[PDB]
Design a protein around this ligand. Structure first.
Ligand SMILES: NCCC[C@H](N)C(=O)O
Length: 273
């Protein structure tokens, strides 16, 4: 029914540490005023397509803007993220409070078992299974917990490129059976697993030039796809598949290694038969 997306404004946003390669050399290189403008434009674009809910940002946790990593939602349930890095672990109580205040039933992993939420685990849009990344942030051993808690098949995919350290930076299930992804971010076995399930006519394969601009980090609502700047080649492939592309600049967030999809969490994920 209704589609609702959770975002968190950049009131306290900065690059203060280095926990992925995009952040290297970028400490205090973000413009907070430009980040506000970019986030506001993204917020407006998303709000034209879905309801947007907000969680108040916490000072001292600049990556809280990246709500995709708050947890993994299905129905009335959420698996709360347990961050790999101490630099984001302080976001956990704030996200937990939002989920509890908004009526979700929260599952929590053991403190020593990292898992970084929808940013690292994305449902097939027909609900057939959950694609779950591992290799840099989420632990493979977390996947059976998610499978049981959410009663879903989990298809584990191994990330091999430190630039593409969250599943959502290189992999984006879309409506209509389509999958937008960057194959070199995955090992050979994981590519074979993807290929077994998604036939060639449903694959929208990005090249490295688009991948490094976070083309796969896209927000898809129905036939609309929202992302950072991408090539005309990719835009034409998406248009041929039936999608309406909306671009909005996110350079200040790429300095932290995230883009449009990372700045969002779809909190209405229906359970489908
Ligand atoms: N999904 C984007 C998260 C970006 C953040 N700086 C991190 O390294 O977790």
């Amino acid at each position: 029914d209704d589609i609702r997306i959770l975002m968190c404004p950049p009131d306290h946003y900065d690059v203060d540490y280095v926990i992925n390669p995009w952040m290297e050399g970028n400490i205090h290189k973000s413009s907070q005023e430009r980040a506000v403008e970019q986030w506001k434009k993204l917020h407006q674009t998303i709000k034209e397509c879905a309801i947007v809910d907000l969680v108040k940002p916490a000072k001292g946790w600049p990556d809280m803007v990246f709500t995709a990593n708050a947890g993994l939602v299905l129905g009335e349930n959420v698996v709360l993220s347990r961050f790999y890095h101490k630099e984001r672990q302080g976001e956990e109580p704030y996200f937990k409070a939002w989920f509890e205040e908004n009526g979700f039933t929260v599952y929590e992993l053991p403190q020593d078992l990292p898992f970084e939420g929808a940013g690292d685990a994305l449902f097939d849009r027909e609900g057939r299974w959950l694609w779950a990344g591992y290799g840099f942030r989420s632990e493979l051993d977390s996947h059976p917990y998610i499978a049981k808690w959410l009663d879903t098949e989990v298809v584990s995919l191994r990330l091999i490129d430190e630039r593409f350290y969250h599943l959502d930076t290189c992999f984006c299930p879309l409506s209509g059976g389509y999958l937008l992804y960057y194959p070199p971010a995955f090992d050979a076995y994981s590519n074979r697993v993807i290929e077994m399930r998604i036939p060639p006519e449903k694959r929208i394969i990005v090249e490295e030039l688009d991948a490094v601009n976070f083309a796969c980090n896209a927000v898809n609502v129905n036939d609309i796809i929202i992302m950072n700047l991408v090539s005309r080649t990719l835009k034409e492939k998406l248009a041929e598949a039936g999608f309406k592309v909306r671009e909005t600049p996110l350079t200040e967030f790429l300095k932290a290694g995230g883009a449009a999809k990372c700045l969002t969490l779809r909190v209405t994920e229906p359970i489908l038969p």
